[PDB]
């Protein structure tokens, strides 16, 4: 729906899972009064890589709520190649370097309405049976101090219709340290596995992004940084089935810590529902106001 030709490039807001995504100012009357929206491309533009993008897109045109990311069109350009998806532009960036700019501003309660925001639009995609799978504050993303959006869906997948699980194995680096262990073991991700990642979410949130409190730094320390390759991950399976877990961030409340780690249970059906997780940070949020 946008043409190539009216697409400006402005700069580029950051390098993701065989993709990228760039600032740029849609302006097709060439008079500077267009508007400023993201583009996210492919890097290597294989054919695989191009079926999960349009799935990606359809994906994303599906959905319509307050947290998450507003689809706005494609680009095609030539042929069918060089596809681009066309999003609204968020000015503050990923919720990860917005916490970290401003941690000596934004209190628990402030975290809590982030952390409700989130919950909401991972139901959301609950009910539309989508599974996230990359959960993080690098793909949280501020359209200002008082709305989150969910932001990337490079990962996605839809789930089959007569089962509650995706499996999936993927050539190439994984989050594993935002991972459920049965995605660890088995590749299989659910709605489940979402909760163990928005735990990780939260963990990430109360430690106010600081770097030496992050899961990946955590988990080789609890681990060994003298582990490398693949005893890495088989450490960190080892780790998380005898119950070694994040620890709780310095001045966070027991509760929140307590909704973390019942998110961390390894028995996937023992894990509370975002609907659950929305009501108990609703009423702590309440509680504190
Ligand atoms: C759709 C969208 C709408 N608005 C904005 N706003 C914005 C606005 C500003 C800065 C910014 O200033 N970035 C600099 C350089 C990169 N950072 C590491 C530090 C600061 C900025 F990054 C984003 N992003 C969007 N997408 C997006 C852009 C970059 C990134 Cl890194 C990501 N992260 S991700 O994990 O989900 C992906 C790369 C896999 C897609 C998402």
Known sequence: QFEERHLKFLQQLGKGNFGSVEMCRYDPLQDNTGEVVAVKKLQHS?????????????????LQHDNI???????????RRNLKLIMEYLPYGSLRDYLQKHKERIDHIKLLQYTSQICK???????????????ATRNILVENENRVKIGDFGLTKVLPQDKE????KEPGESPIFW??????????????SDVWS?????????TYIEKSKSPPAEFMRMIGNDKQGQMIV????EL??????????????????????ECWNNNVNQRPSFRDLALRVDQIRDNMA
């Open 46 to 62: 294989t054919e695989e890589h191009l079926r999960d993008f349009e799935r990606e897109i359809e994906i994303l045109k599906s």
């Open 234 to 237: 088989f450490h960190l399976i």
């Open 69 to 79: 990311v507003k689809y706005k069109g494609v680009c095609y350009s030539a042929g």
């Open 240 to 261: 998380l089935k005898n119950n070694g877990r994040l620890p709780r961030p310095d001045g966070c409340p027991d509760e929140i810590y307590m909704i973390m780690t």
């Open 198 to 206: 928005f735990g990780v979410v939260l963990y990430e949130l109360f």
């Open 121 to 135: 639009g991972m139901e959301y995609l609950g009910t539309k049976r989508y599974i996230h799978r990359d959960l």
């Open 165 to 168: 699980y995706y499996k999936v």
């Open 179 to 192: 991972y459920a262990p049965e995605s660890l073991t088995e590749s299989k991700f659910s709605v489940a």
